[PDB]
Ligand binder design. Structure first.
Ligand code: HEM
Ligand code: HEM
Ligand code: HEM
Ligand code: HEM
Lengths: 428, 423, 423, 428
């Protein structure tokens, strides 16, 4: 089995002593192919890149979600919330069942108004810029997605558009990625706030399903503690990933003017009213295609981890023992030439025009099976709404001829991406 | 709404009583513009010609595929195959899901060797001609496309190049009709039953389960699909290669540029898969031929709900539209004034073309699943043709377009002078 | 002439070496009465506190505006703008004539829509606060007044409500000083040049000719004026709204009467121009806040010729006076004994107030040209604030007045409970 | 173009068959707005009320002074004096140039002593009234302004304070506004007197500049005939208007006690000496403001007339032909809500505290351009002196709660206005 360069008894570990580890891993996958071994002192895992192998790995009878080293550390503040629990922990399935209805079409129609509230603040911010001011794209996308999950999820206003300096969580994430005292202080700040939000609470949100909801299976509700973990979890899982998507999407649009014009024409033809309706967002088919293609190239939660439930042979060549770990490297999956063609690096939303044409397990920016993203429709609805509005209301210019530079935390975002927006002066 | 001349109680119907109805309709569209009412007794439709209205018609939340009068009559032998089924029929979505990945640009790798088998038969036929002899172009292209689907579709050899000449008899229209259906069914069902693995669509159909329902196609629907492959993707592809060759002979600087690409790219005795992907200019030539004469030149839609077309024309749920593709492809606000000229360079960058402006393969989920297959076949064959011969428009052919459910240049003949490059 | 305590060769100067000089001076005025000599090395002035002497000081044939020590130092960045120019400078009278009609109560009709834009931003900020959260009052009023002049003054958006936080750095005082001046000039001169018509003061400046000289302002003086608008009429107006809100929370029957007017008058989702003109009681509240804490609390004068003040105090040509406005506004022979009470009803009829008794906007031709602007803005915003929220003095705030060249209640915080009335 | 009610072939003419025609016209302007057409048999004119249109009308390149019907008739006794001549008549410009110096600061300082002479007689008259006697305000103001122009202008004492019955001119004016024989007799009386005053004449007056003055332009003096017309003209133009102003001003003061007290305090603080000095009068800023505000509401020469010099379009909507007439209705101009605010009817001298705030052409109680009042500084100086003295020496009481009733001749005055004066016993 292929294996990248080693560092004495550190084995491969220093390979990840970089700002950009997922990107380093993508480059190792390009030289070594569909599978390689990665050793650190005291652990091994295998990185998977081809649809052929990833599809077997997605077989829930053979493999289950693993918590990677990263996630194990995140668990210090995310506890047994959905993202950082084991499938077999009682609280995974309980919360999974309680939370599914929170992502129901009925509920999505409920959130639409609050999504529009934050989307409007974003569009007003940009209308109000002076001539030759520019926009800090990920910084503004982050303000939006944080406010949106704050408001839709627990009726709480972060008021990000009213601030330069933010509301701890990002400092907790970086440490996981004196240090002890800070970390503890950060966990505490997150906890009191959230626990205070919980204690204090009649609203159209995720916190409500959690307060008034019983798991049909066990008949038990979530206790207040798992509730806070769930709240912490929405903010870590369902905000920066969405932010990155919108930033990558705008980037690809400004780099591909013909794609921009198709999406813009769609937004003008479809978004006929001063504010978008739920139904109008569902009509933005091409914008949806742009977002999927952005996700294909730069899936913003770019890896997930698995363990073998039993001894098993992968692909008919690589035997695994019970407990062995696998990592799915999503961006390499999404660049599998045998699936997508040889032009995998080009940005072509029309790959998704006829979606049944995409083979099973070839496109996985939202994970797999019962452990896949529950926030998928929410995130796509938000992103489609916001992008539609952006393209309806402004022309965009890549005034610096920005060079793609991708910052890695748990998630991916293009750092320093800036554009200028020229208002079409269409009333909001 | 504009409307062409009427015939008392027959309304507009006698206008379609002609050998060339799509061409009649293009001419009407020239006179009346982007939209006209067409009325017949019992029924009404609206013909659309501008990108401006057609782009709304292509909105899948507002419009869905309709089976035209012609398609309703093809359904007697094509059944609930993909071409002649309604989107809401359970078998549409099942066959769609099962069949669609096996038509990827990537799936062509498995069909490539078989396409080459027939393409080599075509080239040899032409090398073996004596000096005064000429090529009957659509007759030989139909030989090729038919054998190519037979072979790629179900590992069956029509052996059209060993022959001069019942399915075609059926497309015409009421008792011989029953017997025509009979031969196709006996033939196709025997094959299905006879069938062990091949590199064909039938293999994939038998081994195929729909992700949604978890069901396979039943043997009968599978029969309908094979019939449909031939009805849908042999004559259209044949027409395309024939139109393409016509335009090339009529535009010798264009022919010379395509022949140069062919010679520069097709360096091996037979073309590889990657080499075909590299015939950029030949691809542009084919797209331009499709712009001017899309070989399935119309498709029908119905309004899913009450809606308004272009801010002007109210339609009610169930109201019909016909997209007149050759007129759309002549829309001057999209293409510029020179719409009648053959200029492959319009496709220098295919992504420069506006959404819903170029639609020779129809629309959305009801678009042609065989698009990449047809283009891979046409590019390979046309590449080989340009590599191996020079062509002469020896009669100075006068374009005459015959209409069935598809379009082809009837009587188009050429001479080929072999360049003597071996296979 | 009475005179406060001296410090050897430093005379009275060390008395001003304090965070709160105007407040120090009020306290001195309490001890010494209507007039005192204030001496520093090299210079002398006389501080006036009674309406009886101030009314003679306001006689324009006998006294003219003087640039104080503080204003002489502001002139390094404010230049020959209106605030920091001598009356006899050609540019004073030119700018005065050009600018003054564009500040009519009537000219506010054109600024009204822009004032509402910022006022709506203020209200939304507050509606969007979570339940335990509080408002930093002078910080938010400064956000509002600054953005309002930016927008009404030069169609420029400071976007202060999208921010937490170099001009203010300059008012403080000698090398960073040069760079502070630099940013303001680059910024303002670019705008002037960039500039097509807007509803702003800059438009009027560019199109404006002085009736007397027939001249326009030059681009540089125009730069000085824009700078001056912000130095003169953002902090004073900010201080006013903040003091007004302080007094309202400290006097809940007064707040309730103002809130009742607001609710009765502001019947539409946003206020119209006429409706603001109709907030009589809110206007009275603002005037009473200005009586107690006039936010530009002093102005300086010099004797145009030898003259005698109040039959007692000979002054020579060029001798200086300072009008201590908060003391004048506490003159018991004009106002009665209750001068420390907040009573808007003193302004039931503003014309009942004796000439030169109430002077928060200075005097004669050198008075504040932005008076109606400031009051229109303050009345509109305070009307909206009272319409949309109840206010709670949640810390039982202890008035602490910070002094720059203007006065504001530092650290003043409140909670707002939304009344849930839509915009 | 709006037009008030008609009377058959009399058109609008009977509208002016009233004692109070300017006031009738003001009420028509309130219903019809900034411009209306007024037809009489054989003539048309357009009445103007808004600052917007009046400012164009004041453009001397487009419009020149017209003699209205009234002025044409007055011309029967005022001849080609300044007030009733055409701009292009040789004698207008000649006399205009000769007379300008007669209104020079140097000359105004000259007149001050004679103004004080008559002002003193006015104040003595009132000191000498018995308890509970009252004052006939316009009758006394008229006695003052006639004596003042008599004495300052041509060293002639009308001695109005020594009489009940007056010194013909008013009978000549009324007729213009057996009849023939009287009119002729009146013209004659005015003429002999004046011509006698001229023949008979070493003095500090207007008659002197006229006798010893040459027009710098033509080098010609005024002949004795135009001199008499000029003398007649000072008495018709610069006496009743000034009288009306002082009467309106006192009226507004007694109706607005807070304004009275401000003006009175100013008069006591400023007029420190037994008789006012020239410089002290110039210091009466608030009294000046009171007079301007009186003039704003009730301009005592309330209309002037113009003709279009060439075809021209007024305001971009009303085309005019050469010779077309306009009337400026000054009191309506002065009530233009778009200029002054909605409280235009209130008496607020502080409108004038910061005079540069008044827009161009919004305030025109002294006419326009080269045809504006030359007696403006004289009239304001006189009125300011007299009002200051009145407010210095007496308290005033509106003992009858007088109801405003405005008599119209060429000019406006409040008829029957009476007050009681209580002496402050301050030595004169
Ligand atoms: C485009 C934006 C998003 C992307 C690309 C994304 C991607 C993913 C992926 C790949 C996983 C699987 C992780 C693993 O296997 O270890 C996941 C899980 C999860 N995500 Fe999302 N996500 C997005 C938005 C959201 C949003 C908006 C929410 C909340 C509303 C959310 C909440 C969650 C939760 C709770 C889990 C854990 C699910 C479970 O195991 O029960 N995500 N996400
Ligand atoms: C140049 C060649 C071709 C052209 C111009 C063409 C054109 C089209 C058009 C316009 C439609 C939409 C019809 C409608 O909306 O009613 C369609 C559908 C279809 N075509 Fe093609 N076609 C071509 C080649 C092929 C080939 C090679 C195959 C199969 C091997 C094929 C199979 C089909 C099928 C099954 C449908 C129905 C799809 C569905 O509705 O699910 N076609 N074609
Ligand atoms: C409540 C708010 C305000 C207060 C209390 C205030 C107070 C004053 C005072 C006391 C002066 C006279 C200074 C002196 O004699 O040295 C003055 C002058 C001035 N103010 Fe205001 N002001 C206010 C608002 C404004 C606004 C909104 C503007 C402009 C938009 C403005 C522009 C000016 C200017 C340019 C001068 C100098 C005028 C000259 O001398 O020609 N002020 N102000
Ligand atoms: C407040 C009192 C006065 C008012 C309101 C007043 C008003 C006016 C007005 C409006 C005109 C222009 C008439 C027109 O355009 O047809 C005028 C002209 C004239 N006035 Fe005055 N006036 C006053 C006092 C005086 C006095 C005191 C004198 C003499 C000393 C005087 C002498 C004249 C003369 C000679 C003209 C004609 C000027 C010319 O066209 O050359 N007026 N007056």
């Amino acid at each position: 089995m292929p294996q990248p360069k080693t560092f004495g008894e550190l084995k491969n570990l220093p390979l990840l002593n970089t700002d950009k580890p997922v990107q380093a891993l993508m480059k190792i996958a390009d030289e070594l192919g569909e599978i390689f071994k990665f050793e650190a002192p005291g652990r091994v895992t295998r990185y998977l890149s081809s649809q052929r192998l990833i599809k077997e790995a997605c077989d829930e009878s053979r493999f289950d979600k693993n918590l990677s080293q990263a996630l194990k550390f995140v668990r210090d503040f995310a506890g047994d919330g959905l993202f950082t629990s084991w499938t077999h922990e009682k609280n995974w399935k309980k919360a999974h069942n309680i939370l599914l209805p929170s992502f129901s079409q009925q509920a999505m129609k409920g959130y639409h108004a609050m999504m529009v509230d934050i989307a409007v603040q974003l569009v007003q911010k940009w209308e109000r810029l002076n001539a030759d001011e520019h926009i800090e794209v990920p910084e503004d996308m982050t303000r939006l997605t944080l406010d949106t999950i704050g408001l839709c999820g627990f009726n709480y206003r972060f008021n990000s558009f009213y601030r330069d300096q933010p509301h701890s969580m990002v400092r907790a994430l970086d440490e996981a990625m004196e240090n002890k005292r800070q970390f503890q202080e950060d966990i505490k700040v997150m906890n009191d706030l959230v626990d205070k939000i919980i204690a204090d609470r009649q609203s159209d949100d995720l916190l409500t399903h959690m307060l008034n909801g019983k798991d049909p299976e066990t008949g038990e509700p979530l206790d207040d503690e798992n509730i806070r973990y769930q709240i912490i979890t929405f903010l870590i899982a369902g905000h920066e990933t969405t932010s990155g998507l919108l930033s990558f999407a705008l980037y690809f649009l400004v780099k591909n003017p013909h794609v921009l014009q198709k999406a813009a024409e769609e937004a003008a033809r479809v978004l006929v009213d001063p504010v978008p309706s739920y139904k109008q967002v569902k009509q933005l088919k091409y914008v949806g295609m742009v977002l999927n293609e952005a996700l294909r190239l730069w899936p913003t939660a770019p890896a997930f981890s698995l363990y073998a439930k039993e001894d098993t042979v992968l692909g008919g060549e690589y035997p695994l023992e019970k407990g062995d770990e696998l990592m799915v490297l999503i961006p390499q999956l999404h660049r599998d030439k045998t699936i997508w063609g040889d032009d995998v690096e080009e940005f072509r939303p029309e790959r998704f025009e006829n979606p049944s044409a995409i083979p099973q397990h070839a496109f996985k920016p939202f994970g797999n099976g019962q452990r896949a993203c529950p926030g998928q429709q929410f995130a796509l609805h938000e992103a489609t709404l916001v992008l539609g509005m952006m393209l309806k209301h402004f022309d965009f210019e890549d005034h610096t001829n920005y060079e793609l530079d991708i910052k890695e935390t748990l998630t991916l975002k293009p750092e320093g991406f800036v554009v200028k927006a020229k208002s079409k002066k269409i009333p909001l």
